Symmetry: D2
């Protein structure tokens, strides 16, 4: 129900081994750790959560872009890329959070489908 | 030293009257309010800070994209768009944070000049 | 060896039924029709060409964005989105041409992999 | 009436000294040269045309991205970036064509104002 896809606009490749942290806003308005992982050789991160665990809420997907660029010898502009959204407020959906990275720029889009 | 520019990819226009909040990371790792305003008719927010106040540090620019889309009657995906970066005195000294908005997507770039 | 993926930044969905025309620059410097098709329900267009047919050259991928938006009741800015690139000049590669569409904006990236 | 702005997403800077060619579609469906220049130190190209010359029609803005990346020693994907659009007198009358460049990607938007 939640997938993250990361691409590299400099190399024209998947962004491999990118750390991703997901948080859910708690009743006390704090960010609770929800799930985390690293992108694969295809730039994708699957298996973060289940339909049962991925309840209504406000979620934050943090993509560790700075560590990614530093590993390639680029001192980038951003600390990270954060994507913050309400999920599953009209019932369960499938979410793909996609990011396209450059050293001084990033772009993000969502693909939301109803199973 | 710090300018924010916001554009609308649906209407092909500046994003006018968008709330923007700037925070600086404190020593306790919390976000301290730093500056804020609403974008002009040109989609720009000037006069956020001075060279004296804008010291090295980690800054967050929060753009209230959700209110912007709701005001146009368009269902948006994001709660807001956040841009988090380090200001470095070794780098050039004027920072433009630009954002291009769509209902389910945003893009941001930095233009850093002397 | 050539795949096209198109996403809609307004609806947060694949861009379905988008016409795509591919051209190859001929020896006389004209654009020769090479392949064409329409994006699927996933926003993807597969099966445009084969490793054998997809020789070295300069290729143009034309995505008919204007017809797509008009069908959704939006008068868009661009006539089309064109992606022009040299392919296979260092031997065969796999190319994904991806586009993210808004009425007054588009973004494109390439993912190039070596089988 | 027509301005082109080009930004570099790798260096976080204006894209300086980029060749830009503008064409207008002729009645025989060929691209007629209309205007051209090189981007300034601000990444901008002004003075391409006048209100009198910039009549309704189909225009193409060609940005020589390949030469730009080659000059930086960076291997690029695209031969160039082309932006093709209709100028419409019913719409607002100033057109900014903006492009954000990376070696394997570009993004473009239109800012159309009165
Ligand atoms: O399965 C896929 C899912 C999402 C993307 C995204 C592609 C993209 C293209 C062009 C611009 C972008 C801007 C931001 C995020 C993604 C993009 C690509 C895939 O192959
Ligand atoms: O004075 C200006 C300063 C910044 C921008 C930005 C334009 C842009 C274009 C194309 C893609 C983008 C993606 C993210 C952010 C900005 C963009 C435009 C201006 O006229
Ligand atoms: Na609900
Ligand atoms: Na060769």
């Amino acid at each position: 129900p939640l997938m993250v896809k990361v691409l590299d606009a400099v190399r024209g490749s998947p962004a491999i081994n990118v750390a991703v942290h997901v948080f859910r806003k708690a009743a006390d308005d704090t960010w609770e750790p929800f799930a985390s992982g690293k992108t694969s050789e295809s730039g994708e991160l699957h298996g973060l959560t289940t339909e049962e665990e991925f309840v209504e809420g406000i979620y934050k997907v943090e993509i560790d872009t700075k560590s990614y660029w530093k590993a390639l010898g680029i001192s980038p502009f951003h600390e990270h890329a954060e994507v913050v959204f309400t999920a599953n407020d009209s019932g369960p959906r499938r979410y793909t959070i996609a990011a396209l990275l450059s050293p001084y720029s990033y772009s993000t889009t969502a693909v939301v489908t109803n199973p």
